[PDB]
Amino acid sequence: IAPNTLSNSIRMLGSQSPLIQAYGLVILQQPDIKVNAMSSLTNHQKFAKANVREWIDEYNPKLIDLNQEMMRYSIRFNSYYSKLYELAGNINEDEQSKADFTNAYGKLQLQVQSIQENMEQDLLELNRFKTVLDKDSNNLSIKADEAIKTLQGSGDIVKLREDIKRIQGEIQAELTTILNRPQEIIKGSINIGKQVFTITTKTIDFVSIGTLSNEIVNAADSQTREAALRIQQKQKELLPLIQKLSQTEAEATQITFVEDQVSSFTELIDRQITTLETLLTDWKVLNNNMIQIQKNVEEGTYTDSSLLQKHFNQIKKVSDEMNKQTNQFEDYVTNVEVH
């Protein structure tokens, strides 16, 4: 049993969370729109908003609950460690101690079992949502492409559209890189902004991730700061591209935003669900390993109790790291705020 059994999935589920909350609020806040060139657009947008709220109301808090469960397990385990380490060393010294260790260790394995089963249920329910969302986004992307091709007159609008999407993707990735870096103290803020463009008339709304907090923009960590500066620049690059597209065909802009916003959020949801699957795959390895220790104690394999103490310590190292990462998770979803 490696101290690294559970990799970095617990932490990453936390650090992924503020970006998902931001890209979600962008969808909620982009205004309800009708476009004659794509009459399905209104309904696709309806679905997108309802999906985001489903994630807020129903799904995201499963992840929060899981995390609390793994934290409380690690607290419990750590609280019993010294006495159970001592029992482990005495399993052959007296048949009653062997009883007492197998009883308590067994309860802790049951608790680990119980978290595994909650995880498994969570993931079944989360993949039902992922199925709907992934389909919704792809339907919308397909009808967007089709409406745009009807707008495009006599290569202009496609090129602009692509460049706007390219830059939005580069922003998304830089933001991810920021949230992936080691923060000693986990703190900051992502604000969502609204911009308006004027054509002839009429006005065009553009909601997006706007300003990042002082903690990020002036981070001591040069990779974080530099990534924050690049975001600032790319945000400004969007602005002539959007005016050009909008003045050429305004509905192409309004379609472009909705489809790009939903696709971002969808990508981030997918990645977070994948991260949970990896956590489950690894948690199963831990639990199995724990069950084998159990079986070998009962079958009498530990004729040398110090080898059981060595294995019990290995599990302590995993407990400690679980406590570390669940606390990080909690910090990310508490202290990196989104408005």
Author numbering: 16 to 169, 171 to 216, 222 to 360
Paper's wording?
Nhe is a complex pore-forming toxin (PFT) consisting of three proteins, NheA (41-kDa), NheB (39-kDa), NheC (40-kDa), encoded by one operon containing three genes nheA, nheB and nheC, respectively. Separately, these proteins show no toxicity, but as a binary complex some activities (NheA + NheB: ~5%) were seen and maximal activity is obtained only when all three components are presented (100%). The NheB and NheC components are able to bind to cell membranes, whereas NheA was believed to lack this ability, despite the fact that binding of NheA to NheB/NheC is thought to be the final stage of pore formation. In conclusion, the structure of NheA has revealed an architecture showing it to be, like Hbl-B, a member of the ClyA toxin superfamily of α-pore forming toxins (α-PFTs).
We report here the crystal structure determination at 2.05 Å resolution of NheA by selenomethione Multiwavelength Anomalous Dispersion (MAD). The NheA crystal structure shows that there are eight copies of the NheA molecule in the asymmetric unit. There was no evidence of oligomerization as all eight molecules of NheA all appear to be monomeric using the criteria of PDBePISA. Excluding these regions of disorder, the alpha carbons of the eight molecules superpose on one another with an RMSD of 0.3-0.4 Å and therefore can be considered as almost identical. As expected from the structures of Hbl-B and ClyA, with which NheA has 20% and 18% sequence identity respectively, the structure of NheA is predominantly composed of α-helices with approximate dimensions of 95Å x 40Å x 20Å. The tail domain forms the main body of the structure and consists of five major helices designated: αA (Ser 24- Gln 44); αB (Leu 56 – Gly 104) with a distinct kink at residues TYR 95 and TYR 96; αC (Glu 110 - Leu 166) with a kink at residue Leu 141; αF (Ala 271- Glu 319); and αG (Ser 326 – Thr 355). The head domain includes two long α-helices: αD (Asp 172-Leu 195) and αE (Ser 243-Thr 269) separated by a β-hairpin consisting of two long β strands: strand 1 (Gly 204- Thr 216) and strand 2 (Thr 222- Leu 233). Unlike ClyA the two strands in this hairpin actually form part of a three-stranded β-sheet as Strand 1 forms hydrogen bonds to a third, very short β-strand from the tail domain, which is formed from 4 residues (Val 357, Glu 358, Val 359, His 360) at the C-terminal of the protein. The structure reveals a similar overall fold to B. cereus Hbl-B and E. coli ClyA, but, unlike them, its enlarged "head" domain displays on its surface an enlarged β-tongue which is of amphipathic rather than hydrophobic nature. Intriguingly, we show here that in NheA a β-hairpin of similar sequence appears to be held in position by five hydrogen bonds from a short third β-strand that forms the C-terminal of NheA (red).
